[PDB]
Amino acid sequence: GKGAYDTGTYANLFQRSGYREDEIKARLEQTWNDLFYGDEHTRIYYPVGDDKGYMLDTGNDDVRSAGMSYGMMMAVQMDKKHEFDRLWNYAYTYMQHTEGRYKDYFAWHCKPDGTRLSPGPAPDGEEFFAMALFFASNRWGDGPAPYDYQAQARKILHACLHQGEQGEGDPMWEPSNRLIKFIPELPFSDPSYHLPHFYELFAQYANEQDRTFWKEAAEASRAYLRTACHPVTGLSPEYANYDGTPAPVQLHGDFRHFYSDAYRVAANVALDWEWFRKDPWQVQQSNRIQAFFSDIDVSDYRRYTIEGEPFNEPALHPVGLLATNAMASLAADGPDADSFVKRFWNTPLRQGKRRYYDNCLYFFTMLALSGNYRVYQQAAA
Ligand SMILES: OC[C@@H]1O[C@@H](O[C@@H]2[C@@H](O)[C@H](O[C@@H]3CO[C@@H](O[C@@H]4CO[C@@H](O)[C@H](O)[C@H]4O)[C@H](O)[C@H]3O)OC[C@H]2O[C@@H]2OC[C@@H](O)[C@H](O)[C@H]2O)[C@H](O)[C@H]1O
Structure with missing residues (x-):
């Protein structure tokens, strides 16, 4: 078959599970x-x-690039221009570099007032910013700067591939392997950062010189995620080397294990399948991770080694984890798919200081499983 990109048909898994359209x-x-x-x-x-x-990381009392970019996608997917524009204006103003080695990149986190806390960027933000902006252009049309959406997007993705050519700076994609990086400087990656589905659409809307790169990068990232996910459990590390193996322990923590970042891999894999239907492995990966968690309650969610060894330590974001495991039902045909959709429906939004990351994954799953996480093309409006 053909994906939602080709057909314009989006699966309503909540309806398939027996819930009413109205509901x-x-x-x-x-x-x-x-x-x-x-x-x-x-x-x-x-x-x-x-x-x-802005979107507040309640857990860390700061405003992240990943969060602001999640917020913009949420806004444009829900046809919420007023909120979309407020978020983008905050990012463009306080976070986007106008000079230096990071020119056109975004300061990865700042204070609610807009005071930067680190100058360095987080690439998962940049790509989400770019995809969200193209959808804003395609849905609403380019407004006057800084709300010339498709133009802002192309400027960001130009930096992403070409940042080192203008003197000093590093690109967010490693030219040799066409893989997104953890940060510009370090020669390793993050499985959760790989959005091959987003790169298909960059191949359509990016600066003309880069379109070949993005198409190659779509297939490179699909290939990388097959090497990143354990072939039994379908778990993946938070940080990975280009060969897909868990990266060495960093100075700011140990990221070799299935924890917060890794949760988005199963959702990312599932959305690519829904949109493009290119890699039949994505169905098997959705089946595997669902099967690892089929027997486990959200209250019993841990940190796990990719081999599936549970730490005593609990998951920091178990609602987040359930949401991504549920989002995998977009692609899973296994006996756990129906189970996970109902489990998520009967799970409310998280509350308390740690709620931010859980609720971000929650909302993307609500969009996806209702059939409302959609591609907005150059169509006939
Ligand atoms: O913790 C001290 C900081 O570590 C250094 O690393 C930075 C990365 O953490 C960042 O990746 C961000 C982190 O937020 C991610 O989303 C998380 C998911 O977990 C939830 O619990 C949490 O609420 C949620 O926010 C998000 O996906 C990523 O965008 O990427 C940038 C990285 O930058 C750099 O550290 C390396 C160093 O060489 C650079 O100097 C620095 O800019 C930070 O230095 C330090 O503040």
């Missing part, structure tokens, strides 16, 4: 309203002035 759309809208306009123990979005707003 599903109401549940999606409520999730938007709570995360963006809820109470002080739920909402993760905060509007600032008349033309700005």
Whole structure:
């Protein structure tokens, strides 16, 4: 078969699970309203002035590039221009470099007021910023700068591939292997950063010289994720070497294990399958990870070695983990797919100081499983 990119048909797995259409759309809208306009123990979005707003990492009391970029995608996928523009204005103003080795990249986290905490960037932010902006252009049309969406996107993806050619700086993609990097400087990666589905669409909307690269990178990332995921459990490390093996322990933590970052791999893999249907391995990977967690309660979620050895330590984001395991049902045809969809439906949004990452993964799963995580092309509106 052909994917949602070709057919324009999006699977409603909640409907397939037996839930009513009415119910599903109401549940999606409520999730938007709570995360963006809820109470002080739920909402993760905060509007600032008349033309700005941010997504708060409640857990770390800072504003991340990954989070702001997640927020923009959430906004454009839900047809929420006002909120989309507020977020982008915050990112463009406070976070985007206008000079230095990081010119056109984004400072990976800052304070709610906009004061930067580190200058270095996080590539998973950049790619999400780029994809979100192209969808904004395709859905709403380019506004006046800085709301010339497709132009802002192309400028970011130019930097991503070409940052070292203008004197000093490093590219976010390693030219030799066409793989996104953990950060510009270090020659290793993060499985969760690989969005081959997003790169297919960059191959359509990026600067003309780079379109070949993005198409090659789509297939490179699909290949990398086959080497990153354990062939039994379908678990993956947080940081990985280009060969897919867990990276050495870093100075800021041990990232060889299946923890917070790794959760998004199963969701990323599943969305690529839904959109493009290119890699039949993605179905098997969805079956494997679901089968590893088929027997495990959310309250019993741990840190695991990719081999499947549970640490005594609990998962920091078990609702997040359930959401991504549930999102895998987009691609899973196994006997656990139906189970995971119902399990997620009966799981509410997280509350308390650690809620941010859980609720971000929650909302993407709510979008995806309702059939509302869609490609916005140069169509006939
Ligand atoms: O913790 C001290 C910081 O470590 C150094 O590393 C930075 C990375 O952490 C960052 O990757 C970010 C981190 O946030 C990720 O999302 C997480 C998922 O886990 C949840 O619990 C959490 O709420 C959520 O935020 C997100 O996916 C990524 O975007 O990437 C940048 C990296 O930068 C650099 O560290 C390496 C160093 O060489 C550079 O100097 C620095 O810029 C930070 O230095 C330090 O502050």
